Design a protein around this ligand. Sequence first.
Ligand SMILES: Clc1ccc(-c2csc3[n+]2CCS3)cc1
Ligand SMILES: [Cl-]
Length: 548
Amino acid sequence: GKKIDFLLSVVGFAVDLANVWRFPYLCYKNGGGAFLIPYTLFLIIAGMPLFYMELALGQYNREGAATVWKICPFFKGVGYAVILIALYVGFYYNVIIAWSLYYLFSSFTLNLPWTDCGHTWNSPNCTDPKLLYSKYKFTPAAEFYERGVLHLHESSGIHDIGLPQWQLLLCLMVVVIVLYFSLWKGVKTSGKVVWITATLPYFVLFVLLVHGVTLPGASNGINAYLHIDFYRLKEATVWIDAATQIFFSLGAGFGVLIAFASYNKFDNNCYRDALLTSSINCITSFVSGFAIFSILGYMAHEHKVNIEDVATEGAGLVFILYPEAISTLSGSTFWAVVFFVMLLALGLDSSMGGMEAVITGLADDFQVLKRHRKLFTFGVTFSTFLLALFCITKGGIYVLTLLDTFAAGTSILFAVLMEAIGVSWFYGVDRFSNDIQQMMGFRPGLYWRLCWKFVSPAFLLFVVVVSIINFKPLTYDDYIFPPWANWVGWGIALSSMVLVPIYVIYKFLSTQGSLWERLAYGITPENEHHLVAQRDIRQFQLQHWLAI
Ligand SMILES: Clc1ccc(-c2csc3[n+]2CCS3)cc1
Ligand SMILES: [Cl-]
């Protein structure tokens, strides 16, 4: 049972709302298969080594994202930045779960609300195929999503977001209460019911794939998915999106992997865990893309439009597509209930760890918080609830789009780049390899050390620079955000990016001694500070810097 349970956790430690909700519209918005080449390249080169590095760091040092930097005191700013990014993500990650809960509540009927027009939310322009360069939003499913759930028709833009929708308000309250009561006792919440949260997503995906392959237009969708537009690979939008999606689906750069690995056994095999998680993530993402593109190829045929204009390119793509596919199944109410229960379970389980990252990271830094986990959990959860109330307004989709663009973009790329630079160069890739050997019994291969020191940092720096210099003003379908929205988004990104230099400055100023003494204290592990008075600093020799 040692292996079956590990595989179940191991397969579970691989499917989340990233693959099921975000990857579909990033693949659609970016062509089907031209998005997969950069995705796989980044996966290998940067994602797998960084996942391995974070797991090893957490396992060896037994600390969270903030306090793990006792080895290199100058990067506690990086730790704080990743904690802040994790805090930002929840604000809308928990609005997506609220959407799922609302859809589940709406699915308890013999006539699904998204099957045809004729409802109070339907507009005169609603067009039903059965009863008779834009996106088509005049379909029953699009009309339902945008008017009976979002009520987006009551907001003219991000300047007129309006008041929170009360139904989504109740759903968000329920989600927040469930999160709090699942996090208020401690980190130990696995191995009890996660079994059904690990197999249900794959059963749902398999049934969706099998049924959608045999649909009238699925062939065209599959052909578009397997076609590669090579001109799209010369624009850097696909590359930036692929890098950000890789780091958001694997979970690196948020302080979650380090926090959870801090509770591992000192001899746990992090290499095997990283390999299996990455492989399962890639396969699941590919299958999700296949199913999604089959569904929208079917829709292109049914609605008599081009496949590029069938659906939205935003965060509601799955909430349009999956209901459309469900409506084609036999006994569609049962399948809708099953699918939205699966979405609820996936989202709640993932958000649990997402918030645990922040809680553990800040409790390791302050013991007062560690002594009062209930109050601290309540505070974190309540703050998330309010800043998510900001995202369930009539124009809450605009705020959600801005957040999904800026909270973890260049910010997360920069944070992961700083993490890799810190470890590999300042702490020492040789020291890191020695720690991994002391833990798991073997030294990492040359490929892993090369990726940690040279390859991953180079690609991360390139992608950060390209994302900064090739920045497209924010949009949502046919809506163009005002420039101040772009300024606000870049400010949100900087709020996390800037913690690193600020903490470097603060650590330098708060230390006592001469300039060289301050540097030695700042780049020396906290448990070897007695060697600084001995003028024996490894980093002050070329051997440390040329070591691989
Ligand atoms: Cl508030 C929050 C929600 C989700 C994440 C997240 C992004 S990838 C993964 N997670 C979590 C577990 S794996 C982080 C913070
Ligand atoms: Cl993904």
